[PDB]
């Protein structure tokens with residue numbers, strides 16, 4: 300049903316980390332559900348999908364999801380094409396002319412794949428990238444990049460997007476949470492936290508960000524977390540009138556601020572301060588899911604808000620210790636000044 | 637290589653200002669480029685220079701430069717000997733006679749250094765002289781630091797103790813409405829946490845970890861102060877507008893410090909602002925204390941201090957950000 304036509308190249312005969320690039324790309328495409336056909340002159344068997352790979356490439360993605368009609372790209376180089384079966388009606392023997400005709404007749408999008416075009420002079424980089432791949436950031440890039448392109452094209456800048464997302468998140472948190480609309484507040488806050496995350500991709504498309512932009516993005520993270528926790532606290536203290544839960548919420552707020560501060564300050568002194576069980580994404584998911592479940596339409600479970608807040612509280616205290624341990628074990632930490 | 641042979645003594649195990657005299661003289665001589673070897677009977681390893689210290693001594697000089705053949709002295713007392721490697725050819729097992737022979741065979745000059753020969757009955761004077769060497773503040777802060785070091789405390793321990801005591805004061809006294817005693821306790825133990833700097837100066841000089849810990853504990857103390865105040869304001873006073881002002885103060889106090897830390901982590905500046913941590917603490921603590929002052933408390937001091945602080949904090953939040961924006965290299969593109 301799915302055929303992957305790979306053009307034979309000289310470098311696919313080279314070995315890399317025990318296996319040849321030929322078998323490597325073959326198994327990679329087979330994992331993606333493709334039947335692999337190497338070729339020198341293209342003969343289009345009847346299929347529903349065609350993945351045609353013309354340049355020699357090492358694919359660095361484990362899970363490859365291809366749909367629609369796309370041009371696969373990698374660092375600006377056009378790796379291959381993902382066409383429908385209808386391309387057989389346009390393929391007239393001359394591959395370049397058929398490809399150009401098909402691109403003129405159809406709507407195609409670009410598909411940024413984590414891969415590297417193989418040449419005689421970059422195989423060491425291919426080895427390094429394969430090791431990096433073996434340890435989804437690639438799927439994150441493949442989703443964020445078109446949105447970043449669109450936002451840049453309508454005149455937005457990465458820092459502007461940071462401020463927009465942070466302002467919308469604080470507005471949602473401080474408006475919807477105090478009046479008890481925990482589920483729509485959780486949705487709005489999550490949407491605009493994801494929105495604020497786009498500034499990095501936008502700066503990558505501008506061939507570079509700035510240090511001020513990074514500092515602004517992080518300080519805005521702190522502002523947004525403070526606002527989420529403050530709006531939840533307002534609801535818990537004055538809506539629910541729950542003193543124990545206020546204790547948990549104040550603990551969550553202060554500890555999340557200090558957890559981020561430890562990493563920042565350790566790096567300011569030239570040390571490490573990262574780590575911990577609960578970082579910002581897990582922290583936001585636990586509190587927002589707890590708030591959303593507590594106000595879910597029709598079948599809300601109100602105890603989800605306290606359970607999330609208490610678990611996070613303990614999970615934050617522990618993290619605060621863990622990061623301190625990181626600072627304590629960083630080289631030069633106990634060095635005398 | 638140059639070897640410093642120090643004769644072992646019981647008194648080198650005594651601690652002065654947190655560190656032992658053995659470790660103190662060891663680090664001092666290592667700063668001078670010597671490999672330090674403690675001994676009771678001398679075995680001369682091969683070296684280019686020999687620094688022989690026989691009496692127990694505290695060296696009070698930071699920069700010691702030894703080049704020729706010399707006799708180190710201090711106020712008439714012979715501190716040590718600086719001989720060449722050729723002393724290995726004259727050492728016959730008995731150190732005093734070999735030293736006298738080497739002195740008879742060579743011409744040496746007396747190098748007057750700043751040191752003190754240690755005895756059991758002058759350790760207090762030696763500690764006072766060491767304190768003079770390492771550095772009101774002098775009458776109150778330094779003796780308190782010396783006392784805290786003497787009972788085995790270290791700077792990081794005092795940081796944690798002072799922060800824990802201030803957090804306890806804030807979280808016990810403020811929520812039940814005891815704003816004046818809470819302000820007193822918090823101020824006292826913030827000063828206590830500040831004693832960590834003097835203790836580090838008296839010891840090695842402090843660590844990067846210590847600096848990071850002191851600052852993170854500052855953040856914890858500020859969070860606890862504002863949280864106890866918020867508890868009282870929300871459930872004791874039932875004043876919601878003042879609660880928004882207090883939440884603004886809390887969040888902004890965390891974020892203001894985070895900006896500076898994060899900018900410095902990026903190699904930029906982030907300090908400044910109209911209201912810094914000492915001013916913030918003075919404002920909120922004075923407002924709470926005046927609001928709960930004994931006999932004739934003035935209730936409006938708490939809200940005025942908070943709202944000012946809120947307005948003063950938000951502005952500060954911008955200023956530091958502007959500082960980051962104007963730091964050299966801030967807006968440079970990173971390829």
Ligand SMILES: CCCCCCCCCCCCCC(=O)OC[C@H](COP(=O)([O-])O)OC(=O)CCCCCCCCCCCCC
Nearest residue numbers: 473474477478522525526529533876877880883884887888
């Ligand atoms: C500084 C931001 C303040 C602007 C807040 C905007 C809220 C608009 C009102 C939205 C509808 C909420 C209705 C409601 O039930 O609560 C009203 C409440 C104020 O009313 P009152 O009870 O104080 O009279 O409303 C509130 O109390 C809002 C609670 C949020 C207060 C916490 C502010 C913390 C700021 C976070 C960091 C700031 C960035 C520098």
Ligand SMILES: CCCCCCCC/C=C/CCCCCCCC(=O)OC[C@H](O)CO
Nearest residue numbers: 813814815873927928935936938939940943
């Ligand atoms: C610009 C700001 C202008 C503000 C103008 C004043 C507004 C009204 C003041 C209310 C404070 C509450 C008054 C009564 C509560 C006293 C607060 C307090 O500290 O109480 C301690 C004591 O334990 C309690 O019994």
Ligand SMILES: CCCCCCCC/C=C\CCCCCCCC(=O)OC[C@H](O)CO
Nearest residue numbers: 546549550553807811812859860863871872
């Ligand atoms: C580390 C920073 C995060 C820690 C955050 C912890 C905040 C909660 C701590 C103590 C509250 C103690 C409550 C003491 C009793 C309440 C007094 C009260 O307000 O009672 C009002 C009364 O019911 C009608 O006027």
Ligand code: NA
Nearest residue numbers: 461495498516
């Ligand atoms: Na951002």
Ligand code: NA
Nearest residue numbers: 458509511512
């Ligand atoms: Na920027």
Ligand code: NA
Nearest residue numbers: 495516519520
């Ligand atoms: Na951000």
Ligand code: NA
Nearest residue numbers: 540541542543
């Ligand atoms: Na209650």
Ligand code: NA
Nearest residue numbers: 795829832850
């Ligand atoms: Na301290």
Ligand code: NA
Nearest residue numbers: 791842843846
């Ligand atoms: Na230290």
Ligand code: NA
Nearest residue numbers: 829850853854
């Ligand atoms: Na401190």
